[PDB]
């Protein structure tokens, strides 16, 4: 089975594009990255940075996760990210998403040995 670290990568990393400029980026990526089985996953963010630069966030600014737990880390810099949010007319199995692009700080939850991202907690 897919580890938590691997799931974070599949769901949240997109190092090979620098940004989403296409209105169809999320429609394609949510399907490609296996986020549309059974139900459309409603909301998901992709990060357009190298895996090593995202992994490096686990030793950046320690902050609380949005549930108040202490294993979250905010990137010092903004990073290029894309939010994918299921539209108000989307109907599974034809999952439809609004793509929005921005530079924002990311907040990841890290766990394990090695201590790596396992959840995309928030953006700032």
Author numbering: 1 to 124
Direct quotes from the study:
Ribonuclease A was one of the first enzymes to be studied by X-ray crystallography. The commonly accepted residues associated with the active site of Bovine RNase A are Lys 7, Gln 11, His 12, Lys 41, Asn 44 and His 119. Waters W86 and W91 make interactions with imidazole groups of His-105 and His-119, respectively. Both His-119 and His-12 are known to be involved in the catalytic mechanism for cyclization and cleavage of RNA. This is the first ultra-high-resolution structure of a native form of Ribonuclease A to be reported.
The space group is: P212121 (19) and the unit cell is: a = 43.9980 Å, b = 45.6970 Å, c = 51.8900 Å, α = 90°, β = 90o, γ = 90°. Refinement carried out with anisotropic displacement parameters, stereochemical restraints, inclusion of H atoms in calculated positions, five SO42- moieties, eleven ethanol molecules and 293 water molecules, converged with final R values of R1(Free) = 0.129 (4279 reflections) and R1 = 0.112 (85,346 reflections). In the orthorhombic structure Lys-7, Gln-11, His-12, Asn-44 and His-119 occupy single sites while Lys-41 is disordered into sites A and B and the SO42- group into sites A (60%) and B (40%). The A site hydrogen bonds to His-12, and Gln-11 while the B-site hydrogen bonds to Gln-11, His-119 and a water molecule. In Orthorhombic RNase His-12 H-bonds to the SO42- group both directly and via a water molecule. There is good clear electron density for this residue which has been modelled largely as a single conformation but with a minor branch at the end.
